[PDB]
Each structure stands twice: as C-alpha cells, then as structure tokens.
Enzyme design. Structure first.
Site, PDB file in Angstrom:
ATOM      1  CB  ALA A  81      -0.990   0.004   1.156  1.00  0.00           C
ATOM      2  CD  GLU A  87       4.443   6.150  -8.780  1.00  0.00           C
ATOM      3  OE1 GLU A  87       3.267   5.665  -8.601  1.00  0.00           O
ATOM      4  OE2 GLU A  87       4.694   6.959  -9.755  1.00  0.00           O
ATOM      5  CE1 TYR A  89       7.790  -9.290 -11.928  1.00  0.00           C
ATOM      6  CE2 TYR A  89       7.582  -6.933 -11.948  1.00  0.00           C
ATOM      7  CZ  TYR A  89       8.178  -8.110 -11.491  1.00  0.00           C
ATOM      8  OH  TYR A  89       9.118  -8.014 -10.479  1.00  0.00           O
ATOM      9  CG  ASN A  97       4.261  -6.780 -23.066  1.00  0.00           C
ATOM     10  OD1 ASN A  97       3.505  -7.607 -23.621  1.00  0.00           O
ATOM     11  ND2 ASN A  97       4.846  -6.992 -21.867  1.00  0.00           N
ATOM     12  CG  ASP A 122       4.669  -9.473 -26.048  1.00  0.00           C
ATOM     13  OD1 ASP A 122       3.560  -9.708 -25.476  1.00  0.00           O
ATOM     14  OD2 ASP A 122       5.685  -9.036 -25.425  1.00  0.00           O
ATOM     15  CB  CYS A 139     -20.160   4.496  -7.267  1.00  0.00           C
ATOM     16  SG  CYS A 139     -19.011   3.190  -6.553  1.00  0.00           S
ATOM     17  CG  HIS A 158     -18.535   4.533 -11.642  1.00  0.00           C
ATOM     18  ND1 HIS A 158     -18.027   3.508 -10.866  1.00  0.00           N
ATOM     19  CD2 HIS A 158     -18.426   5.666 -10.895  1.00  0.00           C
ATOM     20  CE1 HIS A 158     -17.628   4.000  -9.697  1.00  0.00           C
ATOM     21  NE2 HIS A 158     -17.843   5.308  -9.701  1.00  0.00           N
ATOM     22  CD  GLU A 187     -19.444   8.218 -13.097  1.00  0.00           C
ATOM     23  OE1 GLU A 187     -20.468   7.498 -13.380  1.00  0.00           O
ATOM     24  OE2 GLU A 187     -18.839   8.110 -12.022  1.00  0.00           O
TER      25      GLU A 187
HETATM   26  N1  LIG Z   1       0.736  -7.525 -10.489  1.00  0.00           N
HETATM   27  C1  LIG Z   1      -0.165  -7.221 -11.468  1.00  0.00           C
HETATM   28  N2  LIG Z   1      -1.115  -6.293 -11.220  1.00  0.00           N
HETATM   29  C2  LIG Z   1      -1.975  -5.961 -12.185  1.00  0.00           C
HETATM   30  N3  LIG Z   1      -2.052  -6.435 -13.449  1.00  0.00           N
HETATM   31  C3  LIG Z   1      -1.162  -7.425 -13.707  1.00  0.00           C
HETATM   32  C4  LIG Z   1      -0.201  -7.880 -12.718  1.00  0.00           C
HETATM   33  N4  LIG Z   1       0.524  -8.844 -13.280  1.00  0.00           N
HETATM   34  C5  LIG Z   1       0.067  -9.024 -14.493  1.00  0.00           C
HETATM   35  N5  LIG Z   1      -0.960  -8.163 -14.756  1.00  0.00           N
HETATM   36  C6  LIG Z   1      -1.619  -8.090 -16.053  1.00  0.00           C
HETATM   37  O1  LIG Z   1      -2.151  -9.352 -16.453  1.00  0.00           O
HETATM   38  C7  LIG Z   1      -1.991  -9.513 -17.895  1.00  0.00           C
HETATM   39  C8  LIG Z   1      -1.098 -10.697 -18.115  1.00  0.00           C
HETATM   40  O2  LIG Z   1       0.215 -10.430 -17.487  1.00  0.00           O
HETATM   41  P1  LIG Z   1       1.513 -11.158 -18.062  1.00  0.00           P
HETATM   42  O3  LIG Z   1       1.160 -12.494 -18.701  1.00  0.00           O
HETATM   43  O4  LIG Z   1       2.558 -10.962 -17.006  1.00  0.00           O
HETATM   44  O5  LIG Z   1       1.877 -10.118 -19.246  1.00  0.00           O
HETATM   45  P2  LIG Z   1       2.982 -10.328 -20.438  1.00  0.00           P
HETATM   46  O6  LIG Z   1       3.357 -11.790 -20.486  1.00  0.00           O
HETATM   47  O7  LIG Z   1       2.285  -9.701 -21.668  1.00  0.00           O
HETATM   48  O8  LIG Z   1       4.187  -9.543 -20.059  1.00  0.00           O
HETATM   49  C9  LIG Z   1      -1.423  -8.202 -18.409  1.00  0.00           C
HETATM   50  O9  LIG Z   1      -2.521  -7.320 -18.863  1.00  0.00           O
HETATM   51  C10 LIG Z   1      -0.757  -7.597 -17.218  1.00  0.00           C
HETATM   52  O10 LIG Z   1      -0.693  -6.158 -17.239  1.00  0.00           O
HETATM   53 MG   LIG Z   2       2.927  -9.597 -23.585  1.00  0.00          MG
HETATM   54 MG   LIG Z   3       5.995  -9.789 -19.156  1.00  0.00          MG
END
Ligand SMILES: Nc1ncnc2c1ncn2[C@@H]1O[C@H](COP(=O)(O)OP(=O)(O)O)[C@@H](O)[C@H]1O
Ligand SMILES: [Mg+2]
Ligand SMILES: [Mg+2]
Ligand SMILES: [Cl-]
Ligand SMILES: [Cl-]
Ligand SMILES: [Mg+2]
Length: 1282
Positions: free
Chosen positions: A312, A318, A391, A709, A871, A1122, A1247, A1249
């Site tokens: 969190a 960030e 990821y 990607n 990809d 909401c 939502h 909107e």
């Molecule tokens: N920790 C995360 N939080 C939110 N979205 C995620 C997370 N990990 C993966 N995703 C999403 O889930 C989908 C599949 O992820 P992944 O297979 O890791 O992507 P790729 O192999 O294209 O790099 C993508 O849309 C990615 O952005």
């Molecule tokens: Mg990909």
């Molecule tokens: Mg990846």
C-alpha cells in the site's frame, strides 16, 4: 487524565464462510473449538460529555455494515485491537467523521474485534495458539477484557532530546550510539561525525546522528550506482549512473526533465485539461499541453515483513513522487509488480515446488500474494488511480548458477508500484525558494512509524493522500498563480530527509519549530517527530503573502497542513523546541550533507556453466499443462479485478480484453484528456531468471519485451518511448556485482542508445537476499539480478491499439521470430516447471531487426492492417497462441514445420517477437512490408484462427499437439481460481472459474432500444442556455471530474460543490435544478460506505434542511453514482418516494470488484433512463460495498412491486442473475439501480460517467461512434429540464 473512554458495541464481524474457515483452521491444528462468534466493538475516547442527542448520533454513526445475524455472546472473550502506541487508519477516518458531524468531544475513535470462543478445556498453551490465529502479530494485540482498550489511548508526556557524550567519553560514545540507535554507520562515517562535532565543540544530539545516518545510507547516497569499478582487474571508465545517463546524452529527444526531480517528464499533447476554475467553481476545458510524468518505486523489505501496508505504501509513496513533480502535478494511472518465491498453495502443489524453509521473521510467498495485492489495490482504489498493467513472477529453485549450486528466489520479494501523470509546461521546472519562504508540511500527523521487525510495519491512509492531491490540484490549476514554489514528497527519512533536501535543493537553509509539526503521538521525542516515516505527507515552500490562499485551499479540501519553518539565506539547519525551550538541531548544511569519498568496487566475473535440458520426463502435452500452471504464465485475474480500471474516465485499454474479458492486454493505454484521442501508454518487460545464466541477456530482454508489449499501440517515433529501469540485486553475492555492471552497460551504453531509447528515471534495491538458520545449517535464498523495465509513451491515437483478441474472419497468423531460429530454452518457464535452468537463454539477437520490428509494427498499426497482436514472452509461442485463442474465444490451426525439427524448442523458447493476425487478403502486402524492414527470414506463416474449440499444432502431416481450447483456458485459470478461493468467498471463486468452462458463453453483447448517435440534447445545447448541475463531492471522493464532463457534454454548466462549500454558505442548493453525488471513497468508507457523508448532512440541521428542500421541490433532478448512491441511500429520510429503498453493503465475494459488467435497463419511473428500457450493454463497476440488502423478503417484494428497479445485472445469455461475477456483488434479482416513485431521483452502483465515451469502454461493438449508450442518461437529464 481528564478523558473518559466509552464502549459501543457494533455489528457481527464475520460472515459464515469466514467462521467456517476459522473453525477448519482450529480443527487442522487440533484445537478443539466448537464455535466462534465475533462482533466489532468501538472505543470512544472523549474530552467532554455528550448530551443525549449527541450520544444517539454517536451510537448511530457506529451501526454499519452488513446486517449479519447477531448472537448473545458466550464462551471466552478474546479482543483484538491495534497494538498500543499505534493508531489505525480506521481511527483517523472514523474520528474525522465524528468531528464533521459536530462531535468535537470525541478525541479519538478506535475499533476492535471481540471474539467469543466456545472450546473444550484448553491449556493456557492452546489458548495462546487460538489467540495467534485471530490476530496479526505485527500490528495487533489480544486482550482479555474490553476495558483493556483504555491502554490504546494513554496520554504520554513528550520525551526530551538526548545528547551523545562525545566530549566526555570520546569515540566510544558514537560507537555506543551507532549500536543502540541502529545507525548502521561505517568507520569512516564515525570518523567524520567525530571530527564534525569536535570542530563544533559540542555533543551531537541523538536526532542529529539519526538524521545523518538516514541521509548517509548506501541507498540515500546511491553509493553502488556512483562507485568506481574495477572488473577482472581493469578499471572501468563510468559509474552505473553515468552509463544510465548515457541514454539521455544520446537521446534527449522529448525529455523535459530527467534525474533532477521526483519523476521524469516527457512531452505530451495539447488537449483540453478539464477542471473547476478557482473563481467560478465551474468545470471547463483548458486547451494546453498535458505533458507526461513517469516514475516506478519498489518497496521490497517492508513487504517481506507486513505485505499489506508494504504494498500500500509502495503505491502511496510513488503517488506522492508524482504529485510533487515540478511545482505540482496530477497522477493519472498506475502499474504494479510482484516477484515472490513458490506459492505452494495448500492442496494445489505443483510438481516443481520444494519447501526450502524460510526465516521465521518474514511472511511466505503465498501471504505476500494474498495480502500484498490487496494493499496495493487499497491504495490505488481509495486514492483513485486506475491500475492498468503489471507483472507477477514466481521463482524459487536450487540451480547451478554463477556461484554454483544454490537456492535462488524471492523470499525478500519485489514489490513494484509506478505510474504516469500529467503536468503543465510552466510547472515542470522547480521554482526558486525566496529567502523567507514559508516551509509547510502538507498532510497527515506524525506517529512513531519506521523507527520482530516493528520498524518495518508501514501504515496507509489513502484518503488523506487524496485530500492532499486535491490541494495540489487546486495549486497547479491556478496556472501562473500557483503558490507552490517548490514541493517534495516525504518518504524515507521523514522530515529529516525531506526538509533539508527541499531547502538544499533551492540553495537555502531553514529554521524550523518542532512544536508546529502536526503530531498524533505527544510522547514522541524530537528524534521520533523529525525522523519517523509516517505517510501521506509532502513538504513545500510558499511565499508568505500566499498563506491566506493556501490556507483557504487546504481548509476547503479538509487537507491538514502546518507551517513549520522559514527558508534562510544562510545554509544552516536549525530545529527549535518551544516546549523544552532548546535546540535539537543546530548544524551547517554542509556538515550534514557532506559525505566522505566514493566507493570502489573491485570485483570478478562469474559465469554459469550451463547444463542442457534433461528432457527425460518432458513431453509436449505435459509441458503445455505444466507451463499453464506456472503462476508467471497463468491467468492474473486475482491481481486485476481487485483494482479499479476506470477511475478518471480516461482509460482506453485495460488488462481485460474482448467480450470474454480475458486479462491478456500487453500494455495499458489512457486518453490524454476527456476530449481527445491522443493518450499515453505503459508497458513492462522483465526476465530475471535469464540472469542466472547471462546477466546482459536478461537486461536486453527486459528492454526488448517492454518494446514488444507496447508495439501494437500507435506511437510513431521509437524515440517517444521512455524507460524506467528498476535494478534489483544481491550486491556482494558472488558474481552479482560484475553481472550488474555488465547488465547496466548492456542497456545503457549499448542497446538503448542503439535503439534510441532514453532511461530518464530509475531506482535501485541492492540487498535482494535472505539468510536464516534452518537445521543446524545456514541457509540463503538469493535473487537473480532482476531488472524491471517500464516503458512510457505518448500515444497518437488510442483508437488504433490492437489486442490479442483474434478475429475469425478470413485471416492469416504470422509469427515474427526475432530469435532467428535460435529457439533457446535456457531460463524459460519450460525449464523452470521441470526444475531446471538449461544451457543458453534467449537474448536480443539483432538490434537492427528489433528496431525494424518496432517500426514495421508502427507502420501496420497506423495503416490499420492488423486484426490482432500478442507478443511472445513467458511460456513461448505456445502461450502466445493459447492466450490469443482465449481472448478470441476460438480455435487455431497452425503448422510449425518451418521453425525447426525441435518442436519443444520452437513452441517453448521465450525469444523476442510474437504473432500478428491479418486479414487473409492482406497477407502478401504485410509480408512485403515486413520484408522491407529486414525481417523476411524471421517471418513465418503459421495458419489461421477458426471458429470453435480446437487448438491444433501440426508439423507437416504429424499432429504435434491438439487439445480443447476450453480445456487449456481452464488449466490456465486454475491459479487465479485457487488464489480467489483462499482469499475471497469460495462460492464466488468457484462460480467465476466454472463459467470459464462453458464454451457457449457468447461474451458481452449489446441490445439497444434507442439510437445511441441521436443527440436528443442538441436542440437545447444550441440555445446556449446551460443549466447548472451541482457536482457534489465530499473528502475522499474521486470520480467528480469525469462526472462533470459527462454532464458538460449533455449541455450542463457543471459546478464543483464540496460538502465544505455547503457548510460555509458559498453554495446553496436552491440555485440548482440538478445535483449529482459522485463516486469514490469518502472517508475511506469507514463507518460504512457513504455513511459519514450522509450522516454529516443529517446531523447538521441547516445542511440537512437544504438537502430536504431540494429533494422536495417539484422539478429538481438528482443522480447518485457509486459512493453517491450509497450516500443517498443513507439519507432517504430526506427524499420523497424513497421509502422502499435498500441499503448497499459488502459484496458477497468479500472483495472489491472492478468489472466491466452486463446490465439491462428495466422499466421504472426513472426520468434519467427514458427511452433506454430493454437495452442491454456493459458498464464500469468499481466497488466493494455494492450489494443490495433488504430487511426481509417483504421489503424486496415491495420494492419490486412498486416498480422502482431500474438496472439489473444480466449474464451474457441475457438472464437476470445472482451468479458471480456476472453479478459482481450478490445483489438480489440483479438489482443495481433504483428510482423514486416520481422518477426524479435515481441511484445506481455502476459508473455511467466513466464509460460515456466509446473509447473508454474496455470492450464495445466496432460500429459505435464517439458516444456510448450511457451518454443518453446525461442527455435525458438535459432534455427533462427543458
Ligand atoms: N501484479 C499485477 N497487477 C496488475 N495487473 C497485472 C499484474 N501482473 C500481471 N498483470 C496483467 O495481467 C496480464 C497478463 O500479465 P503477463 O502475462 O505478465 O503479461 P505479459 O506476459 O504480456 O508480459 C497483463 O494485462 C498484465 O498487465
Ligand atoms: Mg505480452
Ligand atoms: Mg511480461
Ligand atoms: Cl533487508
Ligand atoms: Cl468483438
Ligand atoms: Mg504472459
């Protein structure tokens, strides 16, 4: 002393499934617990009495949440509370509600959970094990009486400053302090301090040494990244940081700010920035450049200790980096990353996983992936930024790597949080800090946080940060009159880093008063006040004559602030204490920010042997099954639907793709504004396990994958793409330092300059290893070198983004194999799932061809010649094709004979590239285009997508692999299933999983009862007469801008109306014919979503009357969305015709649901849904407490018979549904909007909107124009007013 604590009982706290889970847990530890019941209990510490009317108000404030069955307490009480000396975020918010309801007598509210345990006779032993199951030892304690909660509120006297007696004891005084305060100082730093204080002729104070130690860590100085190196006996010419900066020296193009602020900045687009004017309170478009900031942080150690707050506050910190860019800026969207060891989910162990143990003091990989995503999402949801890409990698294996056979993994995880924001051109540069500038802390009070590792347990209050962002927004929205001269986030080191950094950056000194800093812990010492790492704070400089303005802005937002010092010409730092009448800090800045020489790292290359993959137990079929079960590969829904993807109304491409909402999008895309098709994109590339074989290849692949990607988004010039490089390593681990240097050189000096990619931002985390004692033996788990690349770019046209959703129109599938037939299997998902590393990994094989790939894709995207793109990355071509077939809900027939005789390697290598789908009639043209960029020999016709359920891979006349596509898609879903099942209501997890196995699901689909292109408001707009709408917001609301914009498009003058404005008389609802209560998280939903907002109105008789009067006028219209729907449901006593309305409570899933859900418009009086009845179309849902709750069936039947239900969730088959997640929250009869008898007030959970613009609908029919169906609500409101 003169406080008194009241106890107020609350509602039942756990649902039947959670009780069962607990009982099952007790059973499996052989603790004979027969029953368990829990209630919330509240503690009010009062500074003066409540009269009966006040007391009834407080009691009412504290009855909230789902109406779970109450029971008379029986058995043994165990009360769980926050630990004494801590204040929960719940406390901060609940006490703010009490104050805003006029209960100033409440000094503080706190909550606990009273458990009532009926057990056999249990040893005191076994009682302690019961207690251990019921609380988090890092944040909570267990008491045996309710009255023990008095300990939470003890008033402590301020602790004085302590001096360290250098003059009376010599160097030993500094040695002792080093140990006792945990300063981690080197010998040469002890020398420097001894000499500094000898020169000053006085003893250092503890606070001064602490501050110094916080400023002089390896990390805060970035010693590794600024070190000189010698590699295999040769001196190197550049530091790691200089090699990163080389990318900027080579490619400065489009960069506005790098390496001199809290984020990097690049050029955006000129668009209508939409916000409410300071002088009118009216929302308007401001046509101007919206430039793009970007940043990525990590928060790795705290997440290993307490993952929810660790994640969190990784996001929270960030977000402050973003808002404190330049002279103030606005976060837009987030990204999230995790790397952990093997999950070993109970009952779903996979065949590569071995238990190697862990340190007692850290949590497991499963606990990190359970609690950590929820924490990251809690901050993004409650602050209000959508989380759009990420990821998640698992890795934990005993491998023959650079330092021989050893355990490599992520017991200390990667927790990564980043994002983009927008910024005005004249605010990119930090301003000058004039002498005499006022120095302000914006944000939350200080507590003793960041000083069993209790010092690593963080604390998040996102609603506080939203309040501060609103102030930051008011400041930048003043343009030339922005009163912020300079701003910085408060993070590591607290004020002890942030304030000296701020004055030093402006070439000033400062003088501060300790007692002007807001504190919620009066016991704290000066060191604790100054150095604590309390959250949701910013430091800034403003001219003295701008204080009255700054004060007005903060007060309207209810953002706390304090003026704590003055910038001085002399470059000195002074902290005075009015309480103790003394001077805890009195130092020249050069003393404090003087720091001894650079490091030299003299190191050696180690290179892993490399062992060919033993394929004894491998078959193609078995590999497919295993790889689909690797979490790295597997469906990510548990990480995706927990986080909002629609807040701002600017999300064009989220993770979920197509009618079946499959989370495979390769990158995120937002629009730049609510009036443009220009935008921004984010992608990630990372490939850490490759670093166990080849450090530089792993870094080149992270860059390459970021690019693959992002590549099917319309960008143009590759020089538009800018990277964050986050470097995670176990520095000092044999081989890792040389590997790190080689990797940084490989991208900084070589690949990125050759491609034309800048790296204008980054971070480093250099102790990615864990050591513990396991048997009698020392054990260690060391990460691979782990570069994470995040790529950010301006987007030319968001409409032209492709996704992996295959078409079944006549088509050709073409592989672009940037591996050039190398087909490497080392350090792949394939290797990992058979407990191996292999021999040789992928790499960037040809830099020209990688650039050519990008350029060819950009040409194909702009010319609209692609149907789809996906990809290749984890899991290879096999997974790329499988994910496309999942997203298109179809089959593929592909032949791989051209890709080599080794079919395993052809299918499972993780070389760069991917699959494009084109129309069959375009195949020759597309192949010729690719040939023009030098790619001919890498390009291979594979075959075609076909209707149906067959996933077929051939090689000449042999079938290499064939299986049901549904079967693969379900296997691929099993990890998210299992995670949802253990984390959420298992019934919902099962329903969602099982629905994936029904191939007849037609996906989201639309039926329209009206013409969505007919602007029924146009004749009204054409008059120029624009009725006002009160866009109502309370502290913590987040969805007000896009609400305003939706009404604006329908011809309204949208007015920003804060609850503070209604309290202060600056607005009166009598001047309005329309009001809308907006979404978000007012008060963090504490005391029940919408409750604090509604009860603040009900308990102020003047404002209550105002609302009642508005609603009883004969022609007024109101909408609640909401949080606004929740708020309006909570003050239905003021609303005529609302007597049958339900309440809105915790979703049946017990989880936040960010979904793109199918709804049908039902017949009701609602004037806002006129013309739309019978329409079915999807809508953005983003909520945790959307479940319609009725008192009993009588109530439901009455509401239904009255005809007041206006929207219902349907399944894809069109039926009204209570099944999850088609109905995301469990509402009976799918109910998710209601109206009043006269139709003038409508409230709804979803939502409209956020999705009034077609481009912001995650999936939609291709024939739609700019307006979605949901635009009609706003147009109906305009036409109704006449
Ligand atoms: N920790 C995360 N939080 C939110 N979205 C995620 C997370 N990990 C993966 N995703 C999403 O889930 C989908 C599949 O992820 P992944 O297979 O890791 O992507 P790729 O192999 O294209 O790099 C993508 O849309 C990615 O952005
Ligand atoms: Mg990909
Ligand atoms: Mg990846
Ligand atoms: Cl550590
Ligand atoms: Cl479609
Ligand atoms: Mg993937």
């Amino acid at each position: 002393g003169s406080h008194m604590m009241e106890i107020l009982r609350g509602s039942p706290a756990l649902s039947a499934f959670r009780i069962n889970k607990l009982l099952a847990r007790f059973q499996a530890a052989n603790l004979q617990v027969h029953n368990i019941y829990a209630e919330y209990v509240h503690f009010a510490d009062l500074n003066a009495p409540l009269n009966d009317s006040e007391q009834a108000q407080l009691t009412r404030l504290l009855q909230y949440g789902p109406a779970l069955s109450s029971h008379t307490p029986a058995g043994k009480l165990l009360l769980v509370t926050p630990r004494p000396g801590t204040i929960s975020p719940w406390s901060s918010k609940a006490t703010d509600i009490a104050h805003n309801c006029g209960l100033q007598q409440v000094d503080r509210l706190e909550r606990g959970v009273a458990y009532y345990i009926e057990a056999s006779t249990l040893t005191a032993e076994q009682w302690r094990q019961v207690a251990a199951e019921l609380h988090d030892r890092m944040m909570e304690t267990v008491f045996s009486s309710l009255t023990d909660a008095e300990k939470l509120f003890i008033h402590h006297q301020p602790a004085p400053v302590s001096s360290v007696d250098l003059l009376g004891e010599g160097r030993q005084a500094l040695i002792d302090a080093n140990l006792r305060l945990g300063l981690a100082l080197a010998e040469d730093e002890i020398d420097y301090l001894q000499e500094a204080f000898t020169k000053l002729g006085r003893n250092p104070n503890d606070i001064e040494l602490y501050m110094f130690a916080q400023a002089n860590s390896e990390h805060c100085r970035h010693k590794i990244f600024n070190a000189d190196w010698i590699i295999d006996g040769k001196p190197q010419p550049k530091s790691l940081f200089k090699m990163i900066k080389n990318t900027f020296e080579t490619t400065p193009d489009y960069v506005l700010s790098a390496y001199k602020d809290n984020a990097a900045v690049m050029e955006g687009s000129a668009v209508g920035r939409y916000f409410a004017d300071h002088n009118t309170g009216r929302y308007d478009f401001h046509q101007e450049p919206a430039h793009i900031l970007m940043k990525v942080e990590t928060h790795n150690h705290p997440t290993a200790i307490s993952p929810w707050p660790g994640a969190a506050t990784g996001s929270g910190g960030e977000i402050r980096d973003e808002g404190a860019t330049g002279r103030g800026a606005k976060p837009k969207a987030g990204l999230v990353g995790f790397s952990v060891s093997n999950l070993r989910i109970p009952g779903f162990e996979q065949p590569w996983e071995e238990d190697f143990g862990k340190p007692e003091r850290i949590v497991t990989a499963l606990d990190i992936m359970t609690e950590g995503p929820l924490g990251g999402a809690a901050f993004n949801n409650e602050f209000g930024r959508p989380a759009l890409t990420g990821y998640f990698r698992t890795y934990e294996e005993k491998v023959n790597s650079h330092n021989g056979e050893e355990l490599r993994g992520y017991h200390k995880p990667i927790m990564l949080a980043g994002g983009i924001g927008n910024i005005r051109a004249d605010h990119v540069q930090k301003g000058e800090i004039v002498v005499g500038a006022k120095l302000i802390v914006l944000g939350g009070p200080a507590m003793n946080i960041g000083l069993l590792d209790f010092a690593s347990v963080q604390r998040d209050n996102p609603e506080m940060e939203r309040r501060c962002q609103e102030v930051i927004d008011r400041c930048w929205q003043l343009g030339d009159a922005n009163p912020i001269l300079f701003i910085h986030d408060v993070g590591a080191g607290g004020l002890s880093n942030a304030m000296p950094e701020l004055v030093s950056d402006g070439g000033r000194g400062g003088k501060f008063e300790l007692r002007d800093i807001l504190s919620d812990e009066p016991g704290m010492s000066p060191l604790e006040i100054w150095c604590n790492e309390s959250q949701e704070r910013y430091v800034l400089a403003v001219a003295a004559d701008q204080l009255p303005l700054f004060d007005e802005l903060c007060k309207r937002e209810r953002a706390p602030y304090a003026v704590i010092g003055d910038a001085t010409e002399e470059q000195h730092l002074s902290l005075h204490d009015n309480h103790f009448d003394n001077q805890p800090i009195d130092l020249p800045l050069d003393v404090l920010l003087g720091k001894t020489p650079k490091m030299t790292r003299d190191v050696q290359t180690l290179k892993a042997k490399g062992d060919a993959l033993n394929r004894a137990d491998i078959t193609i079929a078995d590999a497919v099954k295993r790889v689909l079960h690797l979490p790295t590969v597997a469906e990510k829904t548990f990480l995706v639907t927990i986080g909002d993807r629609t807040v701002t109304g600017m999300v064009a491409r989220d993770q979920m793709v197509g009618p079946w909402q499959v989370p495979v999008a390769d990158c995120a895309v937002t629009t730049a504004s609510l009036d443009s098709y220009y935008g921004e994109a984010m992608s990630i590339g990372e490939r850490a396990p490759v670093a166990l074989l080849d450090f530089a290849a792993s870094a080149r692949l992270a860059v390459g994958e970021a690019l693959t990607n992002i590549a099917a988004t319309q960008i143009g010039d590759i020089k538009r793409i800018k990277l964050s490089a986050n470097w995670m390593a176990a520095a000092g681990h044999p081989g890792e330092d040389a590997g790190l240097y080689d990797a940084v050189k490989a991208v900084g000096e070589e690949l990125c300059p050759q491609l034309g990619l800048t790296i204008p931002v980054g971070k480093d985390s250099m102790s990615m290893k864990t050591r513990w004692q396991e048997g009698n033996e020392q054990r260690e788990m060391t990460s691979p070198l782990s570069l994470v690349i995040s790529a950010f770019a301006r987007v030319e046209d968001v409409r032209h983004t492709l996704t992996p959703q295959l078409s079944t129109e006549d088509n050709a599938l073409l592989l672009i194999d940037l591996g050039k037939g190398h087909n490497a299997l080392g350090a792949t998902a394939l290797a990992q799932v058979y407990r191996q590393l292999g021999d040789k990994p992928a790499d960037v094989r040809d830099v020209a061809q990688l650039k050519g790939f990008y350029d060819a894709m950009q040409a194909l995207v702009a010319a609209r010649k692609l149907l789809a793109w996906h990809d290749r990355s984890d899991g290879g071509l096999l997974v790329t094709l499988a994910e496309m077939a999942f997203a298109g809900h179809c089959g593929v027939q592909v032949d791989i004979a051209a890709l080599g005789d080794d079919h395993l390697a052809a299918l499972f290598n993780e070389e760069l590239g991917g699959v494009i789908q084109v129309r069959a009639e375009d195949r020759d043209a597309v192949e010729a285009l690719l040939a023009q960029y030098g790619l001919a020999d890498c390009v291979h016709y594979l075959g075609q997508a076909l209707a149906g359920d067959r996933f077929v891979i051939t090689a000449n006349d042999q079938t290499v692999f064939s299986e049901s596509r549904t079967t693969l898609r379900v296997w691929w879903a099993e990890t998210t299933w299992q995670m949802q099942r253990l984390r959420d209501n298992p019934q919902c997890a099962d329903q969602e999983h099982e629905a994936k196995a029904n191939d007849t699901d037609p996906g989201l689909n639309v039926k329209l009862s009206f013409d969505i292109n007919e602007d029924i408001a146009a004749p009204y707009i054409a008059t120029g007469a624009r009725p006002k709408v009160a866009v109502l917001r309370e502290q913590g609301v987040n969805s007000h801008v896009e609400m305003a914009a939706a009404f604006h498009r329908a011809g309204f003058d949208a007015i920003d109306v804060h609850m503070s404005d209604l309290l202060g008389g600056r607005i009166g609802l009598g001047n309005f014919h329309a009001l809308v209560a907006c979404g978000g998280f007012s008060y963090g939903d504490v005391l029940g979503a919408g409750e604090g907002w509604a009860k603040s109105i009900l308990f102020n008789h003047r404002v209550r009357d105002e609302f009642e009067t508005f609603f009883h006028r004969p022609q007024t219209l109101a909408l609640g969305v909401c949080n606004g729907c929740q708020m309006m449901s909570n003050l239905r006593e003021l609303i005529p015709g609302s007597e049958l309305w339900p309440r809105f409570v915790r979703n049946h899933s017990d989880r936040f649901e960010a979904r793109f859900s199918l709804v049908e418009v039902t017949q009701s009086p609602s004037l806002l849904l006129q013309g739309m009845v019978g329409s079915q179309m999807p809508i953005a849902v983003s909520h945790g407490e959307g479940r319609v709750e009725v008192r009993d069936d009588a109530h439901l039947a009455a509401l239904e018979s009255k005809g007041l239900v206006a929207l219902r969730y349907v399944d894809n088959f069109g039926k009204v549904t209570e099944t999850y997640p088609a109905n995301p929250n469990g509402s009976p009869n799918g109910i998710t909007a209601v109206t009043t008898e006269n139709g003038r007030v409508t409230i709804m959970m979803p939502h409209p909107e956020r999705v009034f613009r077609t481009v912001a609908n995650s999936w939609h029919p291709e024939n739609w124009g700019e307006d979605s169906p949901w635009m009609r609500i706003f147009r109906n409101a305009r036409k109704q007013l006449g």
